[PDB]
Amino acid sequence: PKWIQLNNEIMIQKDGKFQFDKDKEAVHSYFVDYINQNTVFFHNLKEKLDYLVENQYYEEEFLSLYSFEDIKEVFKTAYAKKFRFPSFMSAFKFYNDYALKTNDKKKILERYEDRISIVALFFANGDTEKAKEYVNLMINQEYQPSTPTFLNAGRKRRGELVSCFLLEVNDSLNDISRAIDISMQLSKLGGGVSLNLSKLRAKGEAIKDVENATKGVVGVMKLLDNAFRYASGAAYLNIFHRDINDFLDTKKISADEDVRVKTLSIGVVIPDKFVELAREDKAAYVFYPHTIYKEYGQHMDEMDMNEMYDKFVDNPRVKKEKINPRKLLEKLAMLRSESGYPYIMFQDNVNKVHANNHISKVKFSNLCSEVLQASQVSSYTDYDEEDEIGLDISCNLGSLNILNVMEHKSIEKTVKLATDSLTHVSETTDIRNAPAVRRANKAMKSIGLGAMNLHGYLAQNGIAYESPEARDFANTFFMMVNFYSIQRSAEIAKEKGETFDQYEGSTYATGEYFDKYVSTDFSPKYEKIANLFEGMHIPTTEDWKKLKAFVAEHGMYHSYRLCIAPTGSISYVQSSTASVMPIMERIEERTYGNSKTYYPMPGLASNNWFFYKEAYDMDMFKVVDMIATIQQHIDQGISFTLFLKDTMTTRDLNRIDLYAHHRGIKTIYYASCLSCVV
Amino acid sequence: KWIQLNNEIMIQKDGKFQFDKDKEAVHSYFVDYINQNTVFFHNLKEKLDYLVENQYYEEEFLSLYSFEDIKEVFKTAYAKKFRFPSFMSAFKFYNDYALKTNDKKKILERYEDRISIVALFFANGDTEKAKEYVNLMINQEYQPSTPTFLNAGRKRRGELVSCFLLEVNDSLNDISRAIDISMQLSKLGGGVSLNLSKLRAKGEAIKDVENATKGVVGVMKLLDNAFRYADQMGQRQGSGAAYLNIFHRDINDFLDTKKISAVKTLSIGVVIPDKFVELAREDKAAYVFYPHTIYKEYGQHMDEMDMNEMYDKFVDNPRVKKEKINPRKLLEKLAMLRSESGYPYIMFQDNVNKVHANNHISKVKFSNLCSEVLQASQVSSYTDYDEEDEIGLDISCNLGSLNILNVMEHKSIEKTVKLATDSLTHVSETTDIRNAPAVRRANKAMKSIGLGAMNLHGYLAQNGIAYESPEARDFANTFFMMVNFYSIQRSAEIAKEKGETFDQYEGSTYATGEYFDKYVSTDFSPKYEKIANLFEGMHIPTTEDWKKLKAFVAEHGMYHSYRLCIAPTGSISYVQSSTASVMPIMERIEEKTYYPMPGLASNNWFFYKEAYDMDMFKVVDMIATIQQHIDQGISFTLFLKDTMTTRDLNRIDLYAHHRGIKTIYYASCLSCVV
Ligand SMILES: Cc1cn([C@H]2C[C@H](O)[C@@H](COP(=O)(O)OP(=O)(O)OP(=O)(O)O)O2)c(=O)[nH]c1=O
Ligand SMILES: Cc1cn([C@H]2C[C@H](O)[C@@H](COP(=O)(O)OP(=O)(O)OP(=O)(O)O)O2)c(=O)[nH]c1=O
Ligand SMILES: Nc1ncnc2c1ncn2[C@@H]1O[C@H](COP(=O)(O)OP(=O)(O)O)[C@@H](O)[C@H]1O
Ligand SMILES: Nc1ncnc2c1ncn2[C@@H]1O[C@H](COP(=O)(O)OP(=O)(O)O)[C@@H](O)[C@H]1O
Ligand SMILES: [Mg+2]
Ligand SMILES: [Mg+2]
């Protein structure tokens, strides 16, 4: 092939440097000589849209809200910008993973600008003017909806626009069977399911009269394992659950094969009491949760372990087991070193700053440890009896492109317009066969707006990832994202005239959420960073006082608004570095069918090679500082992968773990998440 | 000590075994042990109050009787000084049935106590019927099934039925529900058999996407883990079964999950209609079908259509997808797999439905864990969460067996079957199982019971009759004809007493009269004079009697959709001092504890011929002769010698099929035995 030959000329050194400028000709040799030759061209858009509608690719019910004169302008608004892919891989990933091919998969029916216009039309819901705003937002590459939303919007044979779910499992056979079903019902829809197993009683607990008969959390994982294989799942366990060790032992590569679940990623929920016990090397006790329920009438998973730990240890009716917390903490380091996960969640770093503890304290997370929301377990009763439908969690995700948002000075416009997009995706998803998910989506209206291209933007403006100026930039940037996200949530609250259920008891309504912003200023401390926000207003401490009073009068429409998820193949389309993380490689080498493909990180030039420092060469404690400073202005979580070298002892890894907990990190794991990325 | 007396049976003296030494061993078991470990009470009231106050017995059923009556019923049980004739007969009762204390260190319940509580539970307040129930069980004329006999009248009660049959529809919603129902029933200690014949095969379409289904095998693996999770909370009872019609495309992959060199704890059954046998006999190629392509074409499930009428049409319809296989190879494959695993249970579907009375409800499509219950069923449709489901008809097995020997000793064929039918009817009306809607609906609508029999070989050998003789079949033909006669009569008597009939009875062959064509034209009085003399003092119904019963049923209807089925007899066969079910005995003495067959002496040693020495073709003749008068099925285990080729095994299958055998397999079923 020809376009491959031009891309590989990057590695052919000329004058002592790589031929980065050879990728522009490789992507040019890709649009010519292939994809332009394989687009079944139409004479007019009307001929184009009618074929796509008559032959049943696009849904008809949403084009029916627009007059055709408007649809042509929206499509004209997309091509109006002469958009050119800067890299070969950036166009390769779109026209192979996103563009709509024909049913016989031999012709390209959709190009960029087509996907964007259809998506924009779907978002606007009939508003021709907003559909053009959505086009410009995505064609300037300021905002990028998640893969399930970007790919499946407006199509027939629709995959759900949500592809990430969190379930609560109650402690009964009835609830386990339902959780098995809901997992398959959601898995077939292309979504990832993460289940909290901490309310299930441990191995060797009682079943009514018989005293030693429960198979524990492990047995339910084997049921869930087969269920996901039939139709990527995850299971979180609180670290004080007795089965925590057997929970971790199903993921050793050397597992007994008869107990090894193979399609379940695992997560571990750790409250502060465990960190304190590990720090002082004294013996710790894990508990049989049903003895807690039998005694206190409440789920151990719903009580404050920081207040109840000593009481459980001293209650003789509570059954306990002695463990070594340092050995268990080192063990979490090895399994993460061996599988990337268990995803670690510092439970009290989430709820210290949680706005909706009146609904519930956050108890677990999703497949990549970014979604952190309240939840209430259901109780699916017998057949003839009514069930109690609680609140599960749905992940409506999307990320801004930090680079292009700064180039266009559109922090307010992009965040507020993206919020409308996520709110529309939430109101259009109506999932059946998963009742607690469905009830929670209409009641909580939670969205997850993220960001990407932090490292690419910093390296393209002469700023190092580990530098104090970088942290100073992120501190101001995400403070503005949080500002306008809250502002848009309150603006939507008055337009619609309602708030998310039980908002009256949130810290948004009581004002506690704004204590930090009305007392502390977040304008950049370095003048070099201040010059980056030229031409756009930095909200002052007086602005936050005004927003707090405005929210106090009209309320919030969303219970949760921001979360920073990983960016899968779409990061290539956006010509962006992955998520808010540092880059792993300056140039990537991938083997796609008898051909070597090279993709230098976006914007990588010979004059910024120093600034594209690879993550494995970085100080992970300084990386923790960066993620902690961003988490200050993210109400949910941030997917954080530690990039570790092989030559690190178990004391070095726990020192990084303990440090992250100290700085207030909510979630962490090392470096399956396909359904739950942007 | 009592073991030393029992083992003295095998110390041969005078050239023979010491069979009368078991009489002394059982005496040495009641003294020096169980009397030393039986909680003595001063009065019956002190006993009954302790058992009720300390929450062993339920109070709500003893509250229907005045204590003067309860004392009389208990007095009626001890009135017959009942003694176990063998050591094992009492050993199995006081270890598997008698109610021990909560700490398992003392025996709170003896025989006559268990019999009376069960009898009191059955009669539901009728003191006089409670005495009839006592006499019936203390004479050992009838024996309720293990789940009914063990758990009756207790607190923290286990279900009186422990055997279920499920239909599975072809959707994810229905598979999830079937997974749940299997676990919901297994935790209750029951065995559940699921019909998988409506599930689409591997490589069929899921809506738009082509070649995307995992087939029945993937559903078997989900059910497999489901039974392993819910094992009755530590009772080692992960007993499930899965049936597949042989014309299902996945039939080969279905059988391959049970090869030792491969899912475990899932028994399999194969439903074979006449068309498949015909194709194999004439060495013609056979076609298996993708069931969903049949559904898309004809709107009906392939499992609900007549393959003998539709086969050629299926083969010719180009919109129906088929696959060619060798039926001769598949029969040999069924022969070896049965020889190595006991199952696949084989069901000759057309031998079941030829004589089925309720084909208007459905043709029988599968069976239970041991191939005895054969009843109509209708698939449910478990829809989405916010939509209402459609509840079809599953199957429940309320089992019980009469003791053929003692029924002949008491000349009580009519009294026992009618009274046992009353007991099984009460079990059906007191079982209200939640988490299994179609099971619950069908039990109230169909009211199907399964009365069996045991001690057929033990009775024949104690009257100088060989199992393989024509006189044995002549006895079996006449005896079970009477069971079927008085069972139908009692079923019609209850229909008139209660004034109602089982749902859609009006369209059964009982109502149209076709059911009685054989009995009103052909006589079933014994042909051999030796056999006729055994029924002295008892009336053998003539063709004129059947005419009267047929007209009586036509006016009052039938209360039970199904009445008779001969299930295996588990550990309770020891308590009844009886040979297992209607099968021949496998060994004269079992092995350390030794148990000689009931009544086995040196003067009838010839008649206690061991089953592996018998001609299985003659055994088929015996089972075919009984099946004439059983409306459901008979659990039939072939007893095969090692020196039998896979071609020898197929000859037995085809013969049994020709002779009208309904179900067959080689030689677990614990939840579905009596
Ligand atoms: C969802 C799913 C179904 N199946 C099987 C199980 C059922 O036997 C069969 C029917 O599934 P259904 O749940 O009925 O699927 P559907 O109703 O969306 O589509 P259709 O119009 O074809 O009915 O497909 C799988 O094998 N894997 C799967 O992931
Ligand atoms: C039925 C059953 C349950 N379990 C486990 C799953 C659940 O986590 C736990 C609770 O089962 P449950 O369905 O709640 O049992 P129960 O309600 O009859 O009794 P209890 O009053 O104790 O709730 O037991 C098994 O491990 N094996 C089994 O067979
Ligand atoms: N970098 C690019 N990104 C996207 N499409 C491109 C690119 N370069 C060329 N094309 C495709 O080729 C067409 C124009 O071809 P070409 O002569 O290479 O470029 P231009 O006319 O912009 O100078 C565009 O309309 C588009 O379909
Ligand atoms: N074979 C047996 N079957 C049943 N009960 C027996 C048997 N042997 C002994 N018993 C029990 O042990 C008690 C003691 O028996 P024993 O005194 O020898 O005979 P009996 O009471 O008939 O004169 C009996 O009353 C009975 O409760
Ligand atoms: Mg419970
Ligand atoms: Mg369907």
Side-chain angles (χ1 to χ4, degrees), chain B residues 23 26-28 30-31 35 82-86 90 110:
Chain B
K23 173 260 193 176
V26 69
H27 191 273
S28 173
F30 282 75
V31 197
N35 287 329
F82 175 86
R83 319 269 116 160
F84 283 99
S86 49
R110 306 174 111 256

Side-chain angles (χ1 to χ4, degrees), chain B residues 501-513 515-526 528-535 537-591 593-648:
Chain B
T501 206
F502 73 89
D503 287 13
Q504 302 191 204
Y505 149 83
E506 304 80 356
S508 61
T509 79
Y510 294 115
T512 73
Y515 185 92
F516 304 95
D517 292 334
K518 170 187 53 173
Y519 296 113
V520 303
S521 71
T522 304
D523 179 77
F524 299 92
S525 166
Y528 295 82
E529 184 183 326
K530 183 188 192 318
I531 296 304
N533 292 335
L534 289 170
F535 302 103
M538 265 189 314
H539 169 77
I540 297 89
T542 56
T543 37
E544 209 50 51
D545 288 310
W546 282 100
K547 295 185 182 181
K548 292 181 175 292
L549 175 60
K550 158 185 171 55
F552 182 81
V553 165
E555 184 189 337
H556 304 278
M558 216 101 162
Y559 195 78
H560 311 80
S561 52
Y562 306 89
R563 304 160 287 98
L564 305 176
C565 75
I566 296 171
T569 315
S571 284
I572 195 64
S573 65
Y574 292 93
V575 180
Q576 286 292 312
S577 293
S578 151
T579 66
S581 173
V582 296
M583 303 277 92
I585 62 104
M586 309 177 59
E587 38 195 17
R588 292 192 188 83
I589 310 171
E590 297 175 347
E591 210 188 26
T593 54
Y594 298 98
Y595 171 71
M597 285 306 108
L600 175 262
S602 294
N603 49 288
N604 46 45
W605 182 276
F606 166 80
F607 299 99
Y608 280 92
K609 188 181 185 181
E610 292 175 4
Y612 287 95
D613 304 317
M614 298 190 174
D615 193 299
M616 280 313 101
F617 298 92
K618 295 182 188 179
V619 182
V620 169
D621 291 339
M622 167 62 68
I623 304 308
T625 310
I626 303 169
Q627 190 65 267
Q628 307 181 98
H629 316 288
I630 300 296
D631 56 312
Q632 295 191 182
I634 303 165
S635 181
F636 187 5
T637 47
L638 290 185
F639 309 95
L640 305 163
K641 303 166 80 178
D642 209 290
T643 60
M644 303 218 192
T645 57
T646 52
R647 289 149 290 103
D648 292 317

Side-chain angles (χ1 to χ4, degrees), chain B residues 38-70 72-80 82-96:
Chain B
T38 299
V39 181
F40 87 106
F41 290 84
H42 298 292
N43 194 262
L44 178 68
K45 190 162 189 57
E46 182 187 3
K47 193 195 201 69
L48 291 194
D49 289 320
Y50 173 95
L51 298 184
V52 158
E53 178 67 17
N54 293 144
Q55 292 172 316
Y56 291 108
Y57 289 174
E58 285 163 3
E59 317 121 81
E60 296 81 334
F61 83 102
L62 286 181
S63 298
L64 278 73
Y65 300 91
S66 72
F67 178 82
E68 298 83 280
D69 292 326
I70 300 181
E72 182 77 22
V73 169
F74 268 87
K75 164 185 173 298
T76 314
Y78 293 94
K80 182 200 197 67
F82 175 86
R83 319 269 116 160
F84 283 99
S86 49
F87 158 72
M88 261 296 160
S89 60
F91 181 76
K92 292 302 189 174
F93 172 75
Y94 283 100
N95 291 282
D96 300 70

Side-chain angles (χ1 to χ4, degrees), chain B residues 189-200:
Chain B
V192 2
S193 178
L194 300 95
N195 178 16
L196 300 183
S197 298
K198 299 203 200 318
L199 304 171
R200 61 188 76 173

